[PDB]
Amino acid sequence: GLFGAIAGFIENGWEGLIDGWYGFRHQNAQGEGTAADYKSTQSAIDQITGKLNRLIAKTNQQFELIDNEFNEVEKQIGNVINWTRDSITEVWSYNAELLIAMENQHTIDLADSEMDKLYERVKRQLRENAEEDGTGCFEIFHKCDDDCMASIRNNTYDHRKYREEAMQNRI
Amino acid sequence: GLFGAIAGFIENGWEGLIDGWYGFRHQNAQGEGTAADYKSTQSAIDQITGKLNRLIAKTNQQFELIDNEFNEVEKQIGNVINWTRDSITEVWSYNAELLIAMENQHTIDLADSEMDKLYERVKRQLRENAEEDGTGCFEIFHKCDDDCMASIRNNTYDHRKYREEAMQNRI
Amino acid sequence: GLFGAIAGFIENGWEGLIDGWYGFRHQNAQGEGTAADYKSTQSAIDQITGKLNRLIAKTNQQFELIDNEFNEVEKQIGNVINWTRDSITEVWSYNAELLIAMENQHTIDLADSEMDKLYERVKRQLRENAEEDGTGCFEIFHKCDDDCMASIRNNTYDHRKYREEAMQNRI
Amino acid sequence: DKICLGHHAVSNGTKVNTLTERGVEVVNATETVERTNIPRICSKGKRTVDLGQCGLLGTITGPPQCDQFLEFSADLIIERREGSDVCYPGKFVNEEALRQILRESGGIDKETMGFTYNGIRTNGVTSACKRSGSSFYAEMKWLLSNTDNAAFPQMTKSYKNTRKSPAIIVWGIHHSVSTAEQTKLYGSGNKLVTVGSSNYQQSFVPSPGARPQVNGLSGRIDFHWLILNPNDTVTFSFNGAFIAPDRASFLRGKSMGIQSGVQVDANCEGDCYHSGGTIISNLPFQNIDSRAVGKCPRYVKQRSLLLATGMKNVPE
Amino acid sequence: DKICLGHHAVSNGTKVNTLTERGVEVVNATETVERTNIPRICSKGKRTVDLGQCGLLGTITGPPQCDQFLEFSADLIIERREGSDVCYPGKFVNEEALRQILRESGGIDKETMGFTYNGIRTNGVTSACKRSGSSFYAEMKWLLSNTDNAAFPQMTKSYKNTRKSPAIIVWGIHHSVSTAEQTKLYGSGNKLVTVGSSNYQQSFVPSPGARPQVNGLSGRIDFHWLILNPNDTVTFSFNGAFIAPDRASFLRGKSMGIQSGVQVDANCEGDCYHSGGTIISNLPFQNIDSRAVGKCPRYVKQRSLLLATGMKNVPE
Amino acid sequence: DKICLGHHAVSNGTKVNTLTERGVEVVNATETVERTNIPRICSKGKRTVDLGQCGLLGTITGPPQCDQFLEFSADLIIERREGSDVCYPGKFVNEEALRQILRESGGIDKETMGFTYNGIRTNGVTSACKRSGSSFYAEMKWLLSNTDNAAFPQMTKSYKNTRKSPAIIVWGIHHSVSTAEQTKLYGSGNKLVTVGSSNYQQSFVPSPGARPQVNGLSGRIDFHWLILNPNDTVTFSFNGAFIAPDRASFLRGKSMGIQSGVQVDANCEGDCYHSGGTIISNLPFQNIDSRAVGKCPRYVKQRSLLLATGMKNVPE
Ligand SMILES: *[C@@H]1O[C@H](CO)[C@@H](O)[C@H](O)[C@H]1NC(C)=O
Ligand SMILES: *[C@@H]1O[C@H](CO)[C@@H](O)[C@H](O)[C@H]1NC(C)=O
Ligand SMILES: *[C@@H]1O[C@H](CO)[C@@H](O)[C@H](O)[C@H]1NC(C)=O
Numbered sequence A, B, C: 001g002l003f004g005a006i007a008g009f010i011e012n013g014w015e016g017l018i019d020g021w022y023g024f025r026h027q028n029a030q031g032e033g034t035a036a037d038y039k040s041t042q043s044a045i046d047q048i049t050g051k052l053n054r055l056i057a058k059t060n061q062q063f064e065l066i067d068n069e070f071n072e073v074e075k076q077i078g079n080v081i082n083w084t085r086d087s088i089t090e091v092w093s094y095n096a097e098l099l100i101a102m103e104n105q106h107t108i109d110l111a112d113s114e115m116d117k118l119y120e121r122v123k124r125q126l127r128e129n130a131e132e133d134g135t136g137c138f139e140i141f142h143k144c145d146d147d148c149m150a151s152i153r154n155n156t157y158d159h160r161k162y163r164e165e166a167m168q169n170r171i
Numbered sequence D, E, F: 001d002k003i004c005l006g007h008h009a010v011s012n013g014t015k016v017n018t019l020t021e022r023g024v025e026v027v028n029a030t031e032t033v034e035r036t037n038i039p040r041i042c043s044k045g046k047r048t049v050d051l052g053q054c055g056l057l058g059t060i061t062g063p064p065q066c067d068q069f070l071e072f073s074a075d076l077i078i079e080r081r082e083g084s085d086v087c088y089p090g091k092f093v094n095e096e097a098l099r100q101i102l103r104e105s106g107g108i109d110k111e112t113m114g115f116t117y118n119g120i121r122t123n124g125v126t127s128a129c130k131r132s133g134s135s136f137y138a139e140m141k142w143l144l145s146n147t148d149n150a151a152f153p154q155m156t157k158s159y160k161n162t163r164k165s166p167a168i169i170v171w172g173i174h175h176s177v178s179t180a181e182q183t184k185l186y187g188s189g190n191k192l193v194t195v196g197s198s199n200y201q202q203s204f205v206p207s208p209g210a211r212p213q214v215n216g217l218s219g220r221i222d223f224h225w226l227i228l229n230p231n232d233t234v235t236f237s238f239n240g241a242f243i244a245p246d247r248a249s250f251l252r253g254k255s256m257g258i259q260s261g262v263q264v265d266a267n268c269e270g271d272c273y274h275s276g277g278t279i280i281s282n283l284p285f286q287n288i289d290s291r292a293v294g295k296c297p298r299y300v301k302q303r304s305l306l307l308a309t310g311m312k313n314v315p316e
């Protein structure tokens, strides 16, 4: 499903995350934890609602009877009416099935996009102090206590402070 | 065509590949060879098949005559019928031209996606033991005989065992 | 907006660039400058033009009156005509707002793609001689005079010739 | 000492369809086709007129069912299966056009055309249309010969639309059970009634003969009608077999007409109506009734179409 | 010592269209608009009735062409250009409505209306409708006066639909070459035939006068018809110029009717028909015939629209 | 020493809509719904016929307004509000069908049907249709009895379409102010005119009686018409109240007809017309007139829908 992240190199997701859509799971000195990334989560939610206001929406086009349920009109004009309504029905059933297939492919891929954008934006924070393990984690080759994790979780983490250490911890 | 791989940094493809859509071509000790990656190939074909069952498909909606090829009906109702048929015809000719233009853009890019998904997943196995050649190959800076190539082709290759050899072979 | 580049990891764009869509801003020995990447720019413009010729286009299907502005037709066939015209009007108003919403999402995103396509191919030129600064720049850890950057923008730069200098300046 | 990224998931997601697969599991989805009807005419805020046993065209001619409906005024007009346009058995010629007019008229305002007459009876009556005893269409008049088998003066009358809105004139033709009793009514001979505005010309002949009993009687009135426009005149040239308009009808404004069999409900607001109730929904599509009217979601064939609102659901 | 990734390609791909360019070469594509017709009425599995030389409305009245077709039964009914609804020259008023009915009827089942009569001749005949010698419409009867110029008793006949399905009643009017020989047939005077169920009222006048010769004769019968509903009655008040229905027609079930000029073929299955054959295709769109009927792909203007099934084809 | 990549932007973008957003700023966009009309009938390159004060149906019958238009020839036909189909007051039965025919006819070519007559006067005339003094419809002739109340010989006339294109036959019926003065014209008694081709049967009765004055008169001629096909005959059996066709009409080719009130202009080309001018645009959609005809963009409800042609506009 495009972009390669969800149902991809991140093999399956987290039922334990109830605070958002995308999260960090750390493991350090003190041990494991988890916390949800608001700003990436909000970008997905805000984009999905954009779609939801596009379609749960109200046309003001009034339509009237040309037809009669109690005293049927003469059958030639009836058949033209029924023929026209059914052709029109086919169109809207085609448009509906296609619109929602189309928005679903875009939705699924939209979410995966926001993950690859998250992964490869923390790798850019950690520049040369870490490497990607393959399936969605960074091996941080230097120590990062629970204050150095909130450093990453909210765009502050300075690289060159742990740069010296990490380079030869690597070798 | 999006994602940057096909007709991109991978300058043109391989007529010699008859086993699948995506492949590896190695060059090592014994010399060159080639082999096709089933699972990436199958993801494309299975996704194209999804589309093909979406569209090679069966309306069961019956339509009948309100019209007459042998004894033309009176001309006012005829003109309304012809006017209605032609308007509906315009709609379906628009929908058809647009549907397949739309899915063709998605198809082409879907395939390009599956390569970038393959490239940056073997680079993830090869960690620090190789480098981006530019045009779609990895210079493996350590020797990987035909057994260590099947190691990468079926997602087994351990990078640590060749780590130390590679690190200063690069320098 | 997908792909992560525009309104993303490249914090805002450049009013000073009037030579194209995508550009390089350098800073070296002599100081700052800028120059626009034709080949990436032309891929966007040519792709937008493709869309513009698909839609600024000429149906040849003629329609005539079945209706009358001066001596109104009989009221039953009039209502069927008006009912049919309005149903068809609804269809085309749906198709129009949806098509260009659809082409706008694809337009915004394909342009963002062409940036990630450029970023991520000069990083491949620069191999091990540079680092991702985070905000769309490469720190060249070695000296690159005004001919050494005309090397990259013209896809010539040999990394091995500055590799050895860069290996230790980084450390 | 490491960092992992991930995304949320759930025990059971909702399965949806895409361009490439059917039944992908996603975190959250929401329906897009309305299936829920509520079985009432949600009529709050609107001037409603439930015709009940009065037929819509009965509002022009005025059989006893419609005495309370001769000058009605509505935003919403509801027709009912039990409603009859007629007391003395008969039809409207060109009928559904008249209904589609009245439905969207916002009501009717009557006004006499003033007609007086000399040399005829003006007061024919029947046991079909009873009020107190035998009566007749409130808005029309059975014109006869003075006494049995007498001559019907060849008469011509005219009405001018004094107003700036178009009127509906409706006259009728009496088809008598026999040519015998055609005479007892309107005298003898070929009977011609002729009717032209000036944007309309036409004429009519009765057609006596047996038909089966309806409300007891085997005779028929067939009513006719024309849209008369401002400062126009309509002329009625006639010799008999004539049922004559007392009042013309003018339309009040705008309305929407529906025909239904469910209860009005003034606690409910709604703009999409069908005969089995009202579709309240913000959804783009509906699978309830393809002949719904008003301001409706579009009818589609499919009972359901789920729209993803979350990511792909992958568990372990 | 290195490894490269790549993708497949081929000597010639197929050119397709996208949102952004015309004529991208892709590895493999597949057509989406059906162009190939097969020139037969693929009719296997279905109860078929090829009317051939019988006109569809002729099944109600029964001219000699239609003797094998007065009680037919079909899933699929095929009309042919050579087919005629008529023997004695004439036409049906409101004719295409009757056809659209019969086409979807699944056949017709006849049943007498029982009519006997007193004071008339019931057996008029013509050289146009030949069986053995001069004959007439099998399902109707030429009602006349007993002897040249004799009076036509002013008669009334009625039939009630005993069944729980609606009947097709059809009568006609004889327009004679002259008022002179109108009389030799039906006697003298203004001729009135009047016809009302109760959901329908109307009446009819003959119209004698010259017409050019067709099947030899310059006269015309014009047939009329109404659908009588269950436990309803229809009354026939008439004086002459009448052709009288002996049997009423009832509809059997469901069918689809087509018009075509190509051969039946019971080796072929198909649900999409046009006059030049059958569209067998699972593709969403067709460019063969915009008036095709049945269960068809959608007609589009375009001859072709190719759908990519492989990636971009890049060679060296 | 470093290198940065970036993209362009500007002080003011254009706001567009997407699947996920309303009013995002993009560098450049372009409109997709045409709003600009040109208030003229852009007619350059085309054989145009502005009927002006001649009604389209007047081209068949030929009242004085239409003397310059009896055999016209056009690619484009323009009707005008001031145009009249008629001089002696009246109307066409089945009128808009005739108009939709003539509009697409590419003009009409007349040809005599040759009829001469014996025992009648052929030259009736009126003060409504004046040329020099009181006159009549150029293409028709008022058939009368030789002198006041004289008998109208029961006559038979026939015309054969000798050509390989279908003809337009047009006759009409005179409805006299009274049965009294019906007689001074065509003699006494029930008046029958009957008309059958072979593909069409029918007949007509006059309908004398008062109606209000129009052009001075209280009488009406109502015109009728049929498409006669090659090698076919139509026979005119009639006794009076007949206005007879002198010439039949044949269609020249193809055209498109419009209705408008704006000036012809031969300096601008255009294929999409409405009554207020010409829509010159290559845009896919238009918001100008939903009844525009020709080769038009599609009418949509929306005033504007902007299509992005540049990237996201991000400034500082
Ligand atoms: C048209 O369709 C309605 C149902 O939508 C049906 O009740 C009616 O009978 C149809 N008309 C004819 C002539 O069959
Ligand atoms: C309607 O279209 C058919 C062909 O699609 C044509 O043969 C027919 O003549 C048209 N009707 C009229 C009234 O021109
Ligand atoms: C049909 O629509 C036109 C304008 O689109 C309107 O002028 C006309 O009155 C409508 N028909 C009726 C019967 O109102």
Ligand SMILES: *[C@@H]1O[C@H](CO)[C@@H](O)[C@H](O)[C@H]1NC(C)=O
Residues within 6 Å of the ligand: D163, D164, D230, D231
């Ligand atoms: C109707 O009649 C009066 C005549 O006194 C006139 O002033 C008015 O303009 C006429 N027309 C309309 C549309 O009111």
Ligand SMILES: *[C@@H]1O[C@H](CO)[C@@H](O)[C@H](O)[C@H]1NC(C)=O
Residues within 6 Å of the ligand: E163, E164, E230, E231
């Ligand atoms: C018709 O009449 C009979 C009279 O016995 C009755 O049994 C039947 O229910 C009636 N209704 C219908 C629909 O036939």
Ligand SMILES: *[C@@H]1O[C@H](CO)[C@@H](O)[C@H](O)[C@H]1NC(C)=O
Residues within 6 Å of the ligand: F163, F164, F230, F231
């Ligand atoms: C009409 O008549 C002439 C008489 O010779 C004949 O040659 C011609 O083929 C006929 N058919 C048509 C279609 O005109």
